[PDB]
Enzyme design. Sequence first.
Site, PDB file in Angstrom:
ATOM      1  N   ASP A   1      -3.093   4.522  -3.699  1.00 28.03           N
ATOM      2  CA  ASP A   1      -3.236   3.512  -4.736  1.00 28.03           C
ATOM      3  C   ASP A   1      -4.564   2.785  -4.526  1.00 28.03           C
ATOM      4  O   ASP A   1      -5.409   3.219  -3.739  1.00 28.03           O
ATOM      5  CB  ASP A   1      -2.041   2.559  -4.724  1.00 28.03           C
ATOM      6  CG  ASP A   1      -1.890   1.822  -3.410  1.00 28.03           C
ATOM      7  OD1 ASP A   1      -2.333   2.358  -2.373  1.00 28.03           O
ATOM      8  OD2 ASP A   1      -1.332   0.707  -3.413  1.00 28.03           O
TER       9      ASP A   1
ATOM     10  N   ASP B   1       7.249  -0.987  -5.886  1.00 29.23           N
ATOM     11  CA  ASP B   1       6.801  -1.838  -4.796  1.00 29.23           C
ATOM     12  C   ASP B   1       5.807  -2.857  -5.332  1.00 29.23           C
ATOM     13  O   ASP B   1       5.042  -2.578  -6.258  1.00 29.23           O
ATOM     14  CB  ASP B   1       6.154  -1.025  -3.675  1.00 29.23           C
ATOM     15  CG  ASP B   1       6.197  -1.737  -2.342  1.00 29.23           C
ATOM     16  OD1 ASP B   1       7.288  -1.808  -1.740  1.00 29.23           O
ATOM     17  OD2 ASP B   1       5.139  -2.229  -1.899  1.00 29.23           O
TER      18      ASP B   1
ATOM     19  N   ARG C   1      -4.603  -1.087  -5.012  1.00 30.31           N
ATOM     20  CA  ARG C   1      -4.374  -2.516  -4.890  1.00 30.31           C
ATOM     21  C   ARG C   1      -4.481  -2.951  -3.435  1.00 30.31           C
ATOM     22  O   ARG C   1      -4.105  -2.222  -2.514  1.00 30.31           O
ATOM     23  CB  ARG C   1      -3.002  -2.894  -5.450  1.00 30.31           C
ATOM     24  CG  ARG C   1      -2.618  -4.361  -5.260  1.00 30.31           C
ATOM     25  CD  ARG C   1      -1.352  -4.723  -6.001  1.00 30.31           C
ATOM     26  NE  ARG C   1      -1.529  -4.665  -7.446  1.00 30.31           N
ATOM     27  CZ  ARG C   1      -0.560  -4.847  -8.337  1.00 30.31           C
ATOM     28  NH1 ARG C   1       0.685  -5.107  -7.953  1.00 30.31           N
ATOM     29  NH2 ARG C   1      -0.842  -4.769  -9.627  1.00 30.31           N
TER      30      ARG C   1
ATOM     31  N   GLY D   1      -2.116  -0.498   6.310  1.00 26.74           N
ATOM     32  CA  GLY D   1      -2.096  -1.543   7.313  1.00 26.74           C
ATOM     33  C   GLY D   1      -3.276  -2.484   7.198  1.00 26.74           C
ATOM     34  O   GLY D   1      -3.785  -2.716   6.098  1.00 26.74           O
TER      35      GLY D   1
ATOM     36  N   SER E   1       3.861   0.669   2.184  1.00 31.97           N
ATOM     37  CA  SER E   1       5.031  -0.084   1.752  1.00 31.97           C
ATOM     38  C   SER E   1       5.882   0.710   0.771  1.00 31.97           C
ATOM     39  O   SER E   1       7.107   0.558   0.750  1.00 31.97           O
ATOM     40  CB  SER E   1       4.599  -1.402   1.112  1.00 31.97           C
ATOM     41  OG  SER E   1       3.619  -2.055   1.897  1.00 31.97           O
TER      42      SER E   1
ATOM     43  N   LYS F   1      -8.926   3.681  -0.473  1.00 26.36           N
ATOM     44  CA  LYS F   1      -8.125   3.825   0.735  1.00 26.36           C
ATOM     45  C   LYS F   1      -8.233   5.215   1.353  1.00 26.36           C
ATOM     46  O   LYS F   1      -7.647   5.456   2.411  1.00 26.36           O
ATOM     47  CB  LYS F   1      -6.668   3.499   0.414  1.00 26.36           C
ATOM     48  CG  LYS F   1      -6.453   2.057   0.024  1.00 26.36           C
ATOM     49  CD  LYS F   1      -5.014   1.755  -0.305  1.00 26.36           C
ATOM     50  CE  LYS F   1      -4.865   0.316  -0.756  1.00 26.36           C
ATOM     51  NZ  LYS F   1      -3.467  -0.024  -1.112  1.00 26.36           N
TER      52      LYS F   1
ATOM     53  N   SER G   1       1.573  -2.541  -4.286  1.00 23.07           N
ATOM     54  CA  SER G   1       0.866  -1.345  -4.718  1.00 23.07           C
ATOM     55  C   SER G   1       0.675  -1.374  -6.227  1.00 23.07           C
ATOM     56  O   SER G   1       1.543  -1.858  -6.958  1.00 23.07           O
ATOM     57  CB  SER G   1       1.645  -0.092  -4.318  1.00 23.07           C
ATOM     58  OG  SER G   1       1.978  -0.116  -2.943  1.00 23.07           O
TER      59      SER G   1
ATOM     60  N   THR H   1       0.845  -1.224   0.000  1.00 23.50           N
ATOM     61  CA  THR H   1       0.000   0.000   0.000  1.00 23.50           C
ATOM     62  C   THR H   1       0.865   1.254   0.000  1.00 23.50           C
ATOM     63  O   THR H   1       2.019   1.222   0.418  1.00 23.50           O
ATOM     64  CB  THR H   1      -0.961   0.018   1.208  1.00 23.50           C
ATOM     65  OG1 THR H   1      -1.851   1.136   1.105  1.00 23.50           O
ATOM     66  CG2 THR H   1      -0.198   0.082   2.526  1.00 23.50           C
TER      67      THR H   1
END
Lengths: 220, 244, 204, 237, 240, 227
Positions: free
Chosen positions: A17, A166, A19, A47, A129, A33, A169, A1
């Site tokens: 994002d 990453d 995902r 999280g 992340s 999110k 994400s 994330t």
Amino acid sequence: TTIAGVVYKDGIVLGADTRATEGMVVADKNCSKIHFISPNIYCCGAGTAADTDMTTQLISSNLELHSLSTGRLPRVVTANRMLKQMLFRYQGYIGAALVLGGVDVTGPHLYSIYPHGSTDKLPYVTMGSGSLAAMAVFEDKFRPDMEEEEAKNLVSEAIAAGIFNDLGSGSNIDLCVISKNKLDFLRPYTVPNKKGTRLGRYRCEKGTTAVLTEKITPLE
Amino acid sequence: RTTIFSPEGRLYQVEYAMEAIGHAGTCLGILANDGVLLAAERRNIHKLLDEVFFSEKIYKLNEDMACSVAGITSDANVLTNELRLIAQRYLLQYQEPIPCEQLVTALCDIKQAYTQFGGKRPFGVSLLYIGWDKHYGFQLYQSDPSGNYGGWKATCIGNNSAAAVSMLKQDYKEGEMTLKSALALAIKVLNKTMDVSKLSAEKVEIATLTRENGKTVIRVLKQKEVEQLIKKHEEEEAKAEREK
Amino acid sequence: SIMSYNGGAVMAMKGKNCVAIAADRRFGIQAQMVTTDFQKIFPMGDRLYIGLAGLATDVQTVAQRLKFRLNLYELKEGRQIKPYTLMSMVANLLYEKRFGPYYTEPVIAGLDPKTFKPFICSLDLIGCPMVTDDFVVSGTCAEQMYGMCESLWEPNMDPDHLFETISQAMLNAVDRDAVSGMGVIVHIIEKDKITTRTLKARMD
Amino acid sequence: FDRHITIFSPEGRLYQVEYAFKAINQGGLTSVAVRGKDCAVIVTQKKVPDKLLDSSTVTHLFKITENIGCVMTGMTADSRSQVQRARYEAANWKYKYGYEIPVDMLCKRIADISQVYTQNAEMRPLGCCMILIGIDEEQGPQVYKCDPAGYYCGFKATAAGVKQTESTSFLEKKVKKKFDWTFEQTVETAITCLSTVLSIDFKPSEIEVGVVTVENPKFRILTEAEIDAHLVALAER
Amino acid sequence: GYDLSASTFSPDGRVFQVEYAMKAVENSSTAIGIRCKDGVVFGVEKLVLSKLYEEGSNKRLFNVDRHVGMAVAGLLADARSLADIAREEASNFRSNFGYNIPLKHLADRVAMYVHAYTLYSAVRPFGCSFMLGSYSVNDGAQLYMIDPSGVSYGYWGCAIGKARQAAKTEIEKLQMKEMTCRDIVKEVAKIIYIVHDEVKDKAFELELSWVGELTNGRHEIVPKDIREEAEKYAKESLKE
Amino acid sequence: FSLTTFSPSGKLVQIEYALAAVAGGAPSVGIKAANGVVLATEKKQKSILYDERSVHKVEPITKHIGLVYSGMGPDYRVLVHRARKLAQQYYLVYQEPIPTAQLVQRVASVMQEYTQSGGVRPFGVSLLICGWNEGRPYLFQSDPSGAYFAWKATAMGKNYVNGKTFLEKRYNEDLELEDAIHTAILTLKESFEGQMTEDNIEVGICNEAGFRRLTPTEVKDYLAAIA
């Protein structure tokens, strides 16, 4: 994330994002999110998703209960003090890492909140992340007292950096712009990733599947 | 108070709670072989009342039961939630519908505890229950504020109950009571007892309980479905006046 | 692992004005099959179903405790439930056990009982919903079913094709999972009819 | 009978709550509060009967927060309790929500506390009135009063005590003309009201004056050397 | 009636139980306290009902802390209880904040405990008034009195009991703000001997206590050589 | 005197006396048009000193629910808080805004909590609860007993009988939200002992857009017998 925020000359810009993973496998593609807290306060969440959802919902209800007694516009310090006081009480077992931002009579405020109850108010914060890739962009390209579109471009660059470097994400970039006289929740803002067009066709025609039992049950 | 006896072994709060039901609307039930029904009168009669609800006095408790109430209405709204909780607890515990007598015992055990434990008032509510079970079939019960239930074939609670009871004693035809017969009797008992004459269809509420293909059904007759029942009554007692 | 102690597999898939849901029919301990007619899809109203894969104790417990709440709801309320609201009810039911969690990952499929537009959702064991518009899966063969639904699913599908799609995904997925199979059952629900089928599947 | 315990009467009235408004007049003192364009003022009289008392301890003005001040009227022991509860609520507000409590909200919190005493037979109501003052961000200066029954409202001016009707007549007669409200005009109005209804020709020792202004929002209780400055100007014109 | 509970008002906003609890203080022996320039001095008119009681029984001067003293008039069991509460207040204050409690604060904390008994039907109000007295280099000398209602005010001189009027009429003559403690002892004993009536009740004992510079913020019973030297002055000033 | 006691006739007397405190409060009007609901009441002060922009007899519970009352304002401020909490509980569980009938049920439950214990008096308020749910308007009337009634129009408080006959003779369907406000103000003008100003009353409406308390400007607009 991957989630981010900035404070520009007039207000706040948030980004995230879409995902969501369960392991090393992609479950959702168009998640949301960025959460409603108030018409002037929004929050981004990383999280454990359920913890962020329930926490944001609870603080949202409590602020809609506070603003309705006061009859005034809420403040960001109030949301921050609620969130941190709860997360400190749970001693970190609530995995809700947040990026909270809004605009009130005192001006634009932006906070980052950690699941043990620590808080940081800063002109730009990242979380998730892809935090390091986002902040690699913010440290190189951030300036104080920026315009709306410059800030939006910066945040889009940060989330795209978190996406293309990453594994947890991807799949879109959402934004939210907040000011004293406007709010623009942009879902989606850019679509940097699109699935490939499929060449062959595998449409199964009526009969290829074998059946043992059948039942119909009309309704109205 | 309710925790005090009289020298003649009496409990007068329990009697005053029972006297607090004649002030309430009339509700009767009629058992039959094809089914079982209820019939309440709507004293909520006014040109500005809306009637938004499905039904105002018939309350559904389960897939196989409904009830009607007379007395204090707050107490009724308490007891109707407790009934619905008892039913669902039985279902959760056995995954079978609750029979139509265990529920009445369970609510009467609550009503009895208020005549016995210090500072609380007995529920000023009588109830009627109609339902189906796989043990005794169609049933009709009648609770009192003291925690005393009884099985009936036709009864009446509320205003002018002692007159409807006397009528049912003189017109019930046990063993040959269909549902059309029961509704025809209801429109009669409810017209020879209502102070307001002509028995407007706005002033009543009827529910029937029946079975179709091994499923239970609880319907509520609409306005136009009760207009026919009313029109087939003055015709019937106009013919009983022709023979002069 | 935990949820692999009993096994399971559940899928849901939308069409145009319709929706489907499918599950396997096996009950077994770690590696031993006990029963081949185990229920894992439960109706929560007409034009609305729910499916449960995980630990069978939690499957039955969640289904019963949810029917409890649903019956009380639609009794207090005077209306049948919308799918969006059943989703939140389940999310609350599961998040009440945030530290004692039920080991289930439900799947919901239904039609709104006024406009009849389809709905499908997925939840985790602590109640984060996931309202997709293509398909949702939960169980022990989740990757294998993702791989099939990504390739076979199409946007607009009449029921005759939706059934074939959701059947050819489930069969070829459970035929590569050791603790899922011994039959496959499918429900197709429309405005006017609910169709139900058991399929010719391998019993190895 | 229908007057001893907090039950309803046939005419729908609560007499034990009306009898708590009569305890406000047992102290034998009168309070006055007035609002201006940039100020808000509270005024009361300071009656020591003995020369053995320390005049520093004999007060009815109180500091709730740095920015909120109070004057209490009625039974003296009840007022200290209500003031300590106001302070606790003001402190916990800032602990919880991160900014200072307004007067609009503290007043209704005290009123909500007071109403429970009328609806529950545990505790007696408090025979005390309360007038608060404070400066708001957007609304400006504020004057708020609350009752033993849980009633509250904002005011341009008000009074509490024995000479309350004959003070609210003076005040409503002066408010209608709508002159250019100022600090000095406000304090002069309050002192003239308290002088007219009592007819006493005040000294600086016989009153205590607390003030709050948009320039300095901090509540401050005045000195005898600063009340004299306003008292002398009255005799002139 | 309207005078049987402290949860009850009268039609004119009076609570008669709290007043009847003051009527009990009016019927008790007299205690006085005077705030000097460098300390405080307590004096009590201690009545000896029987010769069988030891010299030292029914002490009406209490040490509540090592810098605070307490004199009471009314019901004595109530006073001992309130002393026990005034002790745990000061104890917890040092336990939580780490220094000696001030007297303006202790007075408030005890006044509220006393006021809480004026609100309920299950309790009566306290039947004792009392004075507190302290001295500190920063806070100086201090004297507060607390009534059954829960009121608390500061003082330069004060009395509680039967001869309240007669004693304050003598205390106002004093220029206490000029004097020291050893000189105010004489006056305290003189007033207690003036207001005592030998015909209304039998013989009595004089009980004194101090706090100030000469004890270094330590509340002490007066020594015997000074109490006798003041009781003598009391006798020799009764030639008037 | 006591509340856990029946009379031999079978009446609860303290409830009847709590309704007498509702029957002596300021008037309040309620009208349910086809596309909205109106709530109007008398907000009159005992002096020019009272600041009328500080307290409100018309209050929102949610975006789509609102209140008025007749009787005791201290009692009103408790039920306002309780209703605002219950709506949020419903939202927290179901994530859907509470319907107007479920709130009335759950609030009458609160009013009934205060009718069964000794040591507690009932509320001295009746409520009027307006809403807009499922493309239909609603109007209810909660009482201290724990009983609620759905109305098309009604009036509570002083002169609640003539104010209701006026509605029976001067109200029909096929109205809209603007023809109903005129009728509500006309129904308040019966009992107005003086000139009706923009500050002597308080109005709130609900519709598809949600609940809103009108402003003194909008009140002064229609106070001219305009619309």
